[PDB]
Design a protein around this ligand. Structure first.
Ligand code: ATP
Ligand code: ATP
Ligand code: MG
Ligand code: MG
Ligand code: MG
Ligand code: MG
Lengths: 329, 327
C-alpha cells in the first residue's frame, strides 16, 4: 500500500502565493514507494479543487471540484463532478497553508471534525500563535521575555500619550510582514494603524527590540523535541524571504539558550509537529520572543528548511518525520 | 422569502444529548414567518445528516446525508443521495453544539472556511474559553481574579508538594461537569486525575474557591453588550442545578457581577453570546469560574432562565443572535 496523503494548499489568505510555493517544494520531496498524494488547492476565491499538482497556474490545469468532508464515516474527500460524487478515503492530511484560515485554526477545525490525522499544530496552538498578543500572553506565563506591547481594536483609541519611539505597528494576526510598519514619530502613527487594519481589525503596537534577529526551527510532539541550526537575519517581503546566515554567528551558549528558549515556548504554547520560533537576541545576551510560526514557509528559499537541512535533516527526512508524528497516536 | 438558517446539532461530544435538547428548544421558538430551517444533526459517531428536526432519536427518522461545505462558492450545504448531490445555499448557521468539537473552535473552523455568517464565538475565543487554563491566563491580564490552578499533561507528574486542600480536579477542556472531582486527600488524587483523563489529556487542578456560585448571561458583539438577570446556584452539572433568579445579592454586588462578566467577554473576544460562571466570596469580591461560549439552551437551562427574567423571550433571544450574526 502507499499512504494516501491529502496535500492542501493555496487558500483565501494574503499568503496564498507563498503557500503554492511551499506545496510545490513538498511535492518534489515525497519519494516513490511511500505516498499517493492528492493535491487539494483552495483558490483565492475560496473554491476547492483537486488538481494535478501545485504550481502556477494550476487553476488553469486539470481540476476537479472537491472538498475535505467533516463526516467521519468518509474519513477523506468528496469529489464533485457534475451532480455525481465519489469518496476518496485519506490516511493523513498535510495542510501546507500559510496565514489566515490556515494557521488560524480554521482548517484544523475541519480536520478535527474529520477525525483524519494531520500535520502541525492544533486548533489551540494555532490560535495562540496567530494572535501574537496571545503568544506573548502565554510566553510571559512560562517566564519568557517579550516585547512591550499595546493592543488596539476598532473600538479603542491609540494610547499615544504613552509611547516611546521607535515603535512597530502590526496586525495582531498576520504574517510575512503584511501590515507591519516601523514608526519613529507620533505623526506617522495613524497611517500605520490604518495600513495594519487592512489586515486585522485588532492592531498590535510594539516597543522596538534592539538586537539580532534569530530564528529556530522546532520539530516534535509534546516534550520530545529537536531543533535545527539557529539562523540569523543578515544585512516588502517578510522575514522568510530575507538574507540569512546559517548557522548564526553567536556564542555556543547563545545558541543553546536560543534553542532551549524556542523549545520552552513551543512547549508552553502546546505546539505540535513543527513551528518556527522567531527571536531577538540583545547585546546583553538575553533572549526575547518575536513570533511562533506554526506552519512556516517551506519554499526553496524558506528559512525553516534551510535550518533543518544544515542540521542534517533532508527535506524528505523532515516530511517523513512530520508524517509519522501526525500518526503518532 | 424565508431565511435559510442551518441549525447544526448533536456532535461527537460528551454533551451530545444536551445539544439535542438545546436544538429542540430553539426549534420551537423560530416562528412561522421568518425562518426556513435546516436541521443538520451530527451523529454520536460523527456522521452528518439532514433530518426532520432535533430530538429523541432523530437519527431514526428521515435523515438524508449531507455536509456543510467549506467551499465558498457553495455558501451552504451539499446533499448526498445515491451518488447524486444537490446544493442548498444558507444565509446563516446556528451551531447548537456543546463541548468538544462544538465550543472548542472546530465547527467555527469549518464555518470560517465556508464564508457563511454564524451565531456565536469565533475560533479564537472558543478555544480560549474551552481550555479553562487559557481563560484564566487571559482574565488575569484583564485584572480579573481566578482560582489558584496547576496543570498536568500525561507526561508531567502532578505537583503534590504545591497543592492545598480542598482542591478540584477537572478536564482542562470539557463541560457539564464531566470528569470534575472534589479531592479531599492526597490519596484520592491520582484517581480523580485518571477520572478526568477519560476526557482530556491535559488536566487542570484548582484550589477550592469559597463563595456563592453566581451566573451571568451576556449578549452582544464588541463592546456594546447586554446582560440577563444574575443567577445563583441555590446551595448533572451546573446547568441542571437548582438555581434562583435573580440572585439574592446586593445591588452593588450585582452591578459588579455584570461589569465583571462583560469585561471578561471583552477580554476574551467573545461574540454573539456566552454564559459566565463566577464566584462571589464573602468579602464581596469576584473570582472567575468558566466562560460558557454556547451554553445550554434547554428548557431547564440557566442562560434562558436568566434572559427571560430580564424580559427577553426565548424567541427574542434567537432573533437577536441572528441579527447579531449578520451585523
Ligand atoms: N517589536 C519589534 N522590535 C523590533 N523589530 C520588530 C518588532 N516587531 C516587528 N519587528 C520587525 O519587523 C518584522 C515584523 O514581522 P513579525 O515577525 O513581527 O510579523 P510577521 O507578519 O509574522 O512577519 P514574519 O512572518 O515575516 O516574521 C520583524 O521581522 C522585525 O524585523
Ligand atoms: N476551584 C473551585 N472551587 C470551588 N468549586 C469549584 C471549583 N472548580 C469547580 N468547582 C465546582 O464544581 C463544578 C465544576 O464545574 P466547572 O465549571 O469547573 O466545569 P464544567 O464541567 O464546565 O461544569 P459546568 O459547565 O456545568 O459549569 C462547578 O459546579 C463548581 O461548583
Ligand atoms: Mg509569521
Ligand atoms: Mg518574524
Ligand atoms: Mg462548561
Ligand atoms: Mg461552571
Amino acid at each position: 500500500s502507499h499512504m494516501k496523503i491529502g496535500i492542501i494548499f493555496g487558500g483565501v489568505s494574503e499568503e496564498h502565493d507563498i503557500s503554492v510555493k511551499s506545496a510545490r517544494e513538498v511535492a518534489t520531496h515525497l519519494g516513490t514507494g511511500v505516498f499517493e498524494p492528492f493535491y487539494l488547492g483552495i483558490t483565492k476565491s475560496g473554491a476547492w479543487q483537486l488538481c494535478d499538482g501545485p504550481g502556477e497556474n494550476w487553476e488553469d490545469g486539470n481540476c476537479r471540484p472537491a472538498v475535505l468532508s467533516p463526516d467521519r464515516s468518509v474519513h477523506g474527500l468528496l469529489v464533485l463532478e457534475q451532480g455525481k460524487y465519489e469518496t476518496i478515503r485519506l490516511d493523513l492530511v498535510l495542510p501546507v497553508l500559510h496565514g489566515k484560515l490556515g494557521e488560524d485554526g480554521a482548517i484544523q477545525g475541519l480536520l478535527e471534525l474529520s477525525g483524519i490525522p494531520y500535520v502541525g499544530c492544533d486548533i489551540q496552538s494555532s490560535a495562540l500563535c496567530m494572535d501574537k498578543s496571545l503568544t506573548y500572553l502565554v510566553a510571559r506565563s512560562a517566564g519568557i521575555a517579550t516585547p512591550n506591547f499595546w493592543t488596539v481594536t476598532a473600538d479603542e483609541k491609540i494610547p499615544t500619550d504613552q509611547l516611546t519611539y521607535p515603535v512597530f505597528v502590526k496586525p495582531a494576526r498576520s504574517g510575512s510582514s503584511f501590515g507591519v510598519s516601523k514608526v519613529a514619530r507620533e505623526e506617522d502613527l495613524q497611517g500605520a494603524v490604518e495600513a495594519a487594519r487592512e489586515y486585522d481589525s485588532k492592531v498590535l503596537i510594539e516597543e522596538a527590540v534592539i538586537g539580532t534577529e534569530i530564528g529556530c526551527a522546532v520539530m516534535g510532539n509534546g516534550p520530545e523535541l529537536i531543533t535545527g541550526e539557529v539562523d540569523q537575519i543578515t544585512l516588502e517581503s517578510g522575514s522568510d524571504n530575507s538574507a540569512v546566515t546559517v548557522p548564526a554567528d553567536i556564542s555556543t551558549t547563545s545558541r543553546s539558550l536560543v534553542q532551549d528558549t524556542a523549545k520552552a515556548v513551543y512547549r508552553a504554547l502546546g505546539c505540535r509537529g513543527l513551528s518556527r520560533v522567531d527571536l531577538f537576541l540583545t547585546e546583553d545576551g538575553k533572549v526575547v520572543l518575536n513570533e511562533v510560526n506554526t506552519f512556516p514557509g517551506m519554499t526553496s528559499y524558506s528559512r525553516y528548511p534551510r535550518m533543518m537541512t544544515a542540521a542534517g535533516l533532508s527535506r524528505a527526512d523532515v516530511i517523513d518525520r512530520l508524517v509519522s508524528l501526525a500518526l503518532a497516536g
